[PDB]
């Protein structure tokens, strides 16, 4: 019985990058060929693993993380990057084993008035740890005076909307991202490419 990639890649709605969704994939056969043979992905970058060999491989756990960011942020979904996404929204570890897949979704995620449903964290004191998820909406304190949950000077709501419009430059258009991480543990391997069924 196949791994449910269609449930991830083809979901009607994607999560905001700050509240990125994680789908645990186990006890199944994963045909990766429907992915790297698609041509409808503008990014397909693997790390610590070769594409075209995934159908020959097995793993303990697979995680499929998915979210929306704008196109020129896609390069921040990579190990060892910096910027507002890698720092404050979604962080890949240095020793990342997996694949990052992305594609332009301007026709799904842009609105005529600007889509304001997709958000990112803009204000945060420190960097996230790898695979950390922070969904706090606490008012951010930029000065010495406590905010007491009211927005004012030096007291900023930490999330901001992208405002995706179909007339944005391609670097500012919405892109759907799936991150596949491959967990090779001291346990049985419950996810296998078809050649290892």
């Amino acid at each position, epitope marked *: 019985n196949l791994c449910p990639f269609g449930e991830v890649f083809n979901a009607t709605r994607f999560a905001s990058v700050y509240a990125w969704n994680r789908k645990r994939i186990s006890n199944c056969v994963a045909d990766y060929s429907v992915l790297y043979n698609s041509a409808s992905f503008s990014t397909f970058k693997c790390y610590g693993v070769s594409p075209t060999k995934l159908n020959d491989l097995c793993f303990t756990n697979v995680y499929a993380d998915s979210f929306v960011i704008r196109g020129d942020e896609v390069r921040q979904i990579a190990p060892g990057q910096t910027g507002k996404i890698a720092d404050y929204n979604y962080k890949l570890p240095d020793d990342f084993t997996g694949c990052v897949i992305a594609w332009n979704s301007n026709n799904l995620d842009s609105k005529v008035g*600007g889509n304001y449903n997709y958000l990112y964290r803009l204000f945060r004191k420190s960097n996230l740890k790898p695979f950390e998820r922070d969904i706090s909406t606490e008012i951010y*304190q930029a000065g010495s005076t406590p905010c007491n949950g009211v927005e004012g000077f030096n007291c900023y709501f930490p999330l901001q909307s992208y405002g995706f419009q179909p007339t*944005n430059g391609v670097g500012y258009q919405p892109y759907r991202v799936v991150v596949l991480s491959f967990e090779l543990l001291h346990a049985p391997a419950t996810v296998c490419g078809p050649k290892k069924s």
Partner: antibody
Amino acid sequence: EVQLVESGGGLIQPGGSLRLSCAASGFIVSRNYMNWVRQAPGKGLEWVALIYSGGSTFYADSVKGRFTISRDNSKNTLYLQMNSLRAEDTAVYYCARDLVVYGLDYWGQGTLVTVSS
Amino acid sequence: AIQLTQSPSSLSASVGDRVTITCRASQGISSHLAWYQQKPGKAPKLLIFAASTLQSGVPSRFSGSGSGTDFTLTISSLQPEDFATYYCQHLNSNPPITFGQGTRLEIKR
């Protein structure tokens, strides 16, 4: 009583070094996006360097490898270290607090850097 | 990747007049523009962010508008202290911030 006060500008021979400083008050620099922006005499504004409250730093192509932005939390002060200066780095340098989507709301008074023989 | 071009480069107008300054972006940004006022010997002063929101403390006679590639700053009833160079800025939520080349506004009398 939110202010940014710059110092450290002056005359330096091409290929020399200089550190600028920016004492802040009325916000905490280590908790803010902070920028350096420069203005050559009679010319436009040119972004120089950016530091994140989380620590990441970013530089314009024209200064990368030569400038270093930093801070000191106990002194609530922002620094710009300038190395291998050339004549075209001559400008007044501003520090500024960045509310990235709300713009650059507080700026220092500016400090002139002249690189010349 | 983004260049901002302001037009005209220079402008003169009489007090009480209504003045309009244009910023054109090379690509679609989206309300991610700010306007600054710079008087001689002084740091730039934020007037408008998000293309249309008045910064607190700025007189009501400054207003802004536009989306995408075409933005305008408007002074409703020009006053003698409005003599300045006006700059637009791309409010890029990732580093490469960029400014317009400036529009020098001089007062006619």
